[PDB]
Amino acid sequence: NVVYIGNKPVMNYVLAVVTQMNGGTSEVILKARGIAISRAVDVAEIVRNRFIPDIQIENIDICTEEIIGNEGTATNVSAIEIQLRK
Amino acid sequence: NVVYIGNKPVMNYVLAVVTQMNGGTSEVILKARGIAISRAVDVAEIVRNRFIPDIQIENIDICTEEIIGNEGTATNVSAIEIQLRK
C-alpha cells in the first residue's frame, strides 16, 4: 500500500502503482507533499484512464505537515492522500 | 462562489476566499488544473488553518479535463475541485 510521490517522473510512480495492483494488491494510497501534489493527482488519473479502469478513488484528504526545508529550518507544507481501490 | 486558482500569488486567492466567506457566502468551490492543483490545496489549507478555523472541506473531486489548442491539439489536463463550507 502507500506510495509516496516525489521528484521522480510521474510514469515511474504510475508503473509502481500498476505493477502492485496487477500483482494482486487491492489498495494503494498515494501520498504527496507540496509541489508533488499536482503530480499525485496526475498519477491517479493516468492509472485510471490508461491502465486500470475500474479503479475507484475512495477518499481524498488534504492536510498540512511540518518539514525542515532546504534552508535548514522548519516549515509547513500542504499534503495530500489519495486512496485508490480496485 | 467559484474560484479559479491559477498562478497568481497564493494570497491573492486566499484573500478572495476569506473575504467572500466572511462577508456572507457560506459555500465556495476551489477549482484548478495542472500545476495550479498545488496552489489550490495550499489555498484551502491556509484558509482552514490561518483564517477560518471552522471551515469545512465538503468534497474533493479529481478528474481529467481535455482542452483544444488553437491548432486542434487535444490535451488531457488533471483537474481538481474543492468544496468549502462554513
Swiss-Prot record, chains A, B:
It comes from the Archaea. The gene is albA. One of its GO terms (biological process) is chromosome condensation. Belongs to the histone-like Alba family. It is found in: Cytoplasm; Chromosome. Keywords: Chromosome, Cytoplasm, DNA condensation, DNA-binding. GO terms for cellular component: chromosome; cytoplasm. Its main location: cytoplasm. Gene3D superfamilies: Alba-like domain (3.30.110.20). It comes from Methanothermobacter thermautotrophicus (strain ATCC 29096 / DSM 1053 / JCM 10044 / NBRC 100330 / Delta H). InterPro entries: Alba-like_dom_sf, DNA/RNA-bd_Alba, DNA/RNA-bd_Alba-like. Binds double-stranded DNA tightly but without sequence specificity. Involved in DNA compaction. This is DNA/RNA-binding protein Alba. GO terms for molecular function: double-stranded DNA binding; RNA binding. SUPFAM superfamilies: AlbA-like (SSF82704). Pfam families: Alba.
